[PDB]
Amino acid sequence: RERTVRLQYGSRVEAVYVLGTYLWTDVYSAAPAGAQTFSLKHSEHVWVEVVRDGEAEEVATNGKQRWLLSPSTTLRVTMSQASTEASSDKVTVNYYDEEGSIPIDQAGLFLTAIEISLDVDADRDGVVEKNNPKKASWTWGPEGQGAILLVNCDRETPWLPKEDCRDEKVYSKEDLKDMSQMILRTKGPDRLPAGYEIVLYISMSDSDKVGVFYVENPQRYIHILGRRKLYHVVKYTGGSAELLFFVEGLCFPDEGFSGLVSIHVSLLEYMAQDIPLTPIFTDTVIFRIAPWIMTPNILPPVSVFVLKEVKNLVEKTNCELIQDEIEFGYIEAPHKGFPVVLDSPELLGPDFGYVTREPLFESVTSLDSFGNLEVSPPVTVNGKTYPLGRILIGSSFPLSGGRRMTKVVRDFLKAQQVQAPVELYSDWLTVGHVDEFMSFVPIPGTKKFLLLMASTSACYKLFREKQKDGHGEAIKRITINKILSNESLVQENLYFQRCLDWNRDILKKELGLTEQDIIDLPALFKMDEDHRARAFFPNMVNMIVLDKDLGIPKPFGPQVEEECCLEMHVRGLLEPLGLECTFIGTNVRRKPFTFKWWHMVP
Amino acid sequence: RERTVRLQYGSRVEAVYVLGTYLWTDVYSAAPAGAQTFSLKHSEHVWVEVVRDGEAEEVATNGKQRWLLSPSTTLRVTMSQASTEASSDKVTVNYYDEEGSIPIDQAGLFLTAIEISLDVDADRDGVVEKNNPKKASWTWGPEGQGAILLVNCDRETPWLPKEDCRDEKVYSKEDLKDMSQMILRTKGPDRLPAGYEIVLYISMSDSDKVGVFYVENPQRYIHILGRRKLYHVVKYTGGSAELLFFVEGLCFPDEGFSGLVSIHVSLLEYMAQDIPLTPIFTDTVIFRIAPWIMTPNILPPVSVFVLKEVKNLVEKTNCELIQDEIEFGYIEAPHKGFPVVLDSPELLGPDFGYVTREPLFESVTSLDSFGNLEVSPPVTVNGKTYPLGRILIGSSFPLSGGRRMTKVVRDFLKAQQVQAPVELYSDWLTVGHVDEFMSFVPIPGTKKFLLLMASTSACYKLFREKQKDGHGEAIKRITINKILSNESLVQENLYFQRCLDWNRDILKKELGLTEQDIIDLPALFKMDEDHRARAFFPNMVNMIVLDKDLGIPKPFGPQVEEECCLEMHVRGLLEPLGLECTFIGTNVRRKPFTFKWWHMVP
Ligand SMILES: CCN(CC)C(=O)c1cc(-c2cc(N(C)C3CCN(C(=O)c4ccc5c(c4)nc(C)n5-c4ccccc4)CC3)nc(NCC3(CC(=O)NC)CCCCC3)n2)ccc1F
Ligand SMILES: CCN(CC)C(=O)c1cc(-c2cc(N(C)C3CCN(C(=O)c4ccc5c(c4)nc(C)n5-c4ccccc4)CC3)nc(NCC3(CC(=O)NC)CCCCC3)n2)ccc1F
Ligand SMILES: [Ca+2]
Ligand SMILES: [Ca+2]
Ligand SMILES: [Ca+2]
Ligand SMILES: [Ca+2]
Ligand SMILES: [Ca+2]
Ligand SMILES: [Ca+2]
Ligand SMILES: [Ca+2]
Ligand SMILES: [Ca+2]
Ligand SMILES: [Ca+2]
Ligand SMILES: [Ca+2]
């Protein structure tokens, strides 16, 4: 920051100097008529250079030296410590005529040096460091830097109809733990010279994305910037001082909002009461509002929201106790984080947040329900790494006039960025959800997961062996022989295997999977009036994954032995990998990724 | 592209194979009840591998070999040249039971290999190369790649009320020179197997950004994709074939449109007449729509739009013959480019294009007029390079309730990206334009330019020397002595010098300038009723820059000699750098940067 401060003909000019800047001072155009030359004195804590045509040249406090007055001869003025009274530090310039060794005129510059810094935790360790030089940027990765801000979308105070960020008030110091800290640090004399004030400010646009709070009597809570407050004039305190503000996020990254926001402080010179002039200094900090993050099946379960055997299966973990209403995610900053639940178009408590997106022109379908919303385990895809996974959403083809999740949920999910969503084809299903045909399961040593796919061809292959084994009479009276000889039903399932393979191909491509990673599970569909699939027997892939325990729907199909040839087959596949199958809607809150989302690389 | 193609129990499956992909074929789940093992034959141009648990293993066309039937035993099928009749190439699989050395059943795969490529000039040399592997991306810089598309914002046909891109019709082959070429290249037998078609398509959203044209009888011009045409079914021609399409841009990069657009081709399998199934293949090309670019003063003039001495000054260049209505820019692709004029809220000819942006809710001010719109010479700013310069726009401070150029022109200018706009402070001026206080001028050997700034302090410094020289009577009867002793007027100009220095500081910072690069020109302002500045004498910095000839307003102030102490002073500064001053609204169309905008680096 090089800033212009001209000397004024015959006058003494008072200026405030902010440490970290330097002044360029025109001496020439202040010089009286007929001067040929100037000297200068300057005080201890002012560094002064004289500068002709690039050629810098420092000067002592006391020298009697003269130079030749030219427009190419200017000064550069620095100061290296704040002032303890106003003025005191100074630079004075003498102008001497052709001979005359007494100055004809003089011009001065009376400086008060102050330090002003607007500080945040840009290095992301939870401590608000002193003027991080990257605080005005935001970059990704471990070596990256820039401060993070949560949406205050929980509720500290239960009497309250809405989430904290919904008002412009704070009713509890518990709240401030959800907020990011920003400290205005100043260092100067005991009052500002006349006609200066310090003003925090934000843009009209950011004014619905942030709220800033001052803690008075640290106690009362003052809303200074935010909704309908774009600026706040700050009381300067002298000497070394710190003001503490608390910043809350109000909106998630979304269509038309990247999640970056700015807060500024200006030292504004005035010409009067009102008549503001120009900022003589500005400092800026950036916050990135932290995205909403979903949790996959490979992540350890903490609590299962659910009659009888759901409870009994969960006693083998240390979990507590519709899938279509709710998706559990979280939000995380270096300081704080907490579960936040997305709501399909009120567990709203302390440290349990809430988002919805309601359509406006558009209307909801079955594809909006959050069984149509899943996320992979972490993956690498041609080198790019997805440490938090990829969100998966069932769709229809774009020209097919079929169904689609609302744009407003879709844009929301895209806007979060860190789980780079992938669209699948679920609209061949009557309900239309990705959870009807695919699931992930961890392999309990690793680090490594499996994709489970429904497969009609595996089902026909299984039955043709059973009919061969003579279990064709194994059972409105449904036997294998009965199904196998149903030609019409066979066609439908060839068409459904086609839909399943389309998705198989997307999933492999976008999650970097191979056939090694995929288990096909036998499954069978009947075509409804719309030509869409609905399950024929209980849909086994549509399970609960409580670690290594799998809560798999009970098939009850054409059976043999004292159990079933489907429960034997599915047990045969999963159990030899580590996984304990229990055969029996639910919805499991999980442990966050230990992986911090801000370390993610572009 | 790995794609799924299952064998079908007992059946022969016909498939189309697109070169560049590979198939994964499940053999297991097709195998009859009781098989233990399979062999396979395959034709010459089919490459087949057998794959157990990762372990690939190629197989000959004729071998009698058996393998053990398992779900982990699949095939991988490739083909390396197109087919000349349908089927012909094939893979057949034999299934043998426990002993029996004659196959019990068999399943086949009858492949027709075709080549389909949607091709563009992604390497940016004007020739449409064969399947550039980066054609589906767009990257910046010299080593960067991705195809470029002009907005067709000129007019080939003058009877027409609007610019070409405004309809969905082409009335002249001249037009196609403004368009980008895209070639669907196919290679296959003489007909497609039954139930396949090729479909070009675009998104609803891109459908108002692109128009695509087919030249029939190469002649008639067919609109295939664009406004209200999202898809086009293409006639396959057999053998080695090329279809040529022409693509026109319709909209400039803008708020909410990055300037990237996509066009796709799918091979779509059908189950019937209608009943489309799934794309078995998709190829995608990306275009970046080329931005609108402004031209600075250091660039050579081609024609001056203007009573008497404007004409006489221009005869010293080889130029042809309000500044507030119009800004000359251009647009450039590797193939084509042409001047386009931005219109403040009809030189619309062949190779002379047009854009406007009209506000909607907002209304115009003086700051909308394009004297409030300039651009620097190329600059480097802390390493970042601005090879085309930076657009400069006069503004007011954000909290000041002052004037501002319309958001819609501002967003438009930002959206173009390559001249990263900078806002200045012009609202202290009655009119409010950047051209009232600053100009650039080339230094005629280089490569190097100067910033000229209006300066009230230089003016007072000049007069104080004239009054000293006793020219205080040099001249409603205005003399130097008269001005100097006007105290009220002195104050106003101290305040205006303050506004000028604010801008000086922005300009230095954002154009990486130093005092070395700046000439202050003497200037004087009177404060109007709104406290805003209007010039006192003719505003000299507000000049025409026709190379080394400067067309400088004639000052006519307090004079001496047979001319003026202001025309002597300004001549004294400029002429010793190379520049021929002529003292005398205009608007000069210039030579584009030789620098291609796509080579610019992020
Ligand atoms: C170019 C690819 N692309 C861009 C990425 C797409 O967006 C895309 C679009 C479609 C699609 C499907 C569709 N339809 C009507 C579906 C058929 C399958 N669906 C069924 O309802 C269905 C499913 C199975 C059945 C049954 C109907 N009837 C029978 C008898 N079966 C059956 C099948 C097997 C066994 C037993 C029964 C669901 C809707 N209609 C249209 N129309 C758009 C079109 C113009 C047009 O024709 N408009 C009326 C024609 C296709 C060309 C683009 C222009 N597109 C399909 C795949 C796609 F990739
Ligand atoms: C914090 C910095 N910032 C964020 C980046 C800004 O956007 C910013 C805002 C202003 C600004 C100017 C302004 N005004 C009224 C201008 C005074 C200069 N202008 C004149 O019209 C003008 C100029 C010269 C004159 C004369 C009036 N009257 C006289 C006598 N002179 C004069 C001066 C020298 C010689 C002779 C005459 C033009 C408008 N009014 C308000 N109001 C906003 C505010 C609330 C408020 O007071 N609202 C009513 C107060 C400032 C604090 C933020 C809240 N802001 C100025 C600089 C800024 F950088
Ligand atoms: Ca820190
Ligand atoms: Ca609140
Ligand atoms: Ca809270
Ligand atoms: Ca909380
Ligand atoms: Ca879900
Ligand atoms: Ca090329
Ligand atoms: Ca047209
Ligand atoms: Ca044209
Ligand atoms: Ca043209
Ligand atoms: Ca202009």
Curated annotation (Swiss-Prot), chains A, B:
Effect of mutating D167A: Mildly reduced enzyme activity
Residues reported in the UniProt entry to bind Ca(2+) 1: D121, D123, D125, V127, E129
Catalytic activity, EC: 3.5.3.15
Entry GO terms, CC: azurophil granule lumen; cytoplasm; cytosol; euchromatin; extracellular exosome; extracellular region; nucleus
Record field: catalytic activity: L-arginyl-[protein] + H2O = L-citrullyl-[protein] + NH4(+)
Biological processes per GO annotation: cellular response to leukemia inhibitory factor; chromatin remodeling; estrogen receptor signaling pathway; negative regulation of chemokine-mediated signaling pathway; negative regulation of lymphocyte chemotaxis; substantia nigra development; transcription initiation-coupled chromatin remodeling
MF-aspect GO terms: calcium ion binding; histone arginine deiminase activity; histone H3R26 arginine deiminase activity; nuclear estrogen receptor binding; protein homodimerization activity; protein-arginine deiminase activity
Cofactor(s), by name: Ca(2+)
Residues that hold Ca(2+) 2 according to the record: N152, D154, E156, D164, D175, D178
Main location (coarse class): cytoplasm
SUPFAM superfamilies per UniProt: Cupredoxins, Pentein, Peptidylarginine deiminase Pad4, middle domain
Note accompanying the cofactor annotation: Binding of Ca(2+) triggers a conformation change that is essential for catalytic activity.
Subunit structure of this chain's protein: Homodimer.
Function summary: Catalyzes the deimination of arginine residues of proteins.
Annotated protein name in UniProt: Protein-arginine deiminase type-2
Naturally occurring in which organism (per UniProt): Homo sapiens (Human)
Organism phylogeny: Eukaryota, Metazoa, Chordata, Craniata, Vertebrata
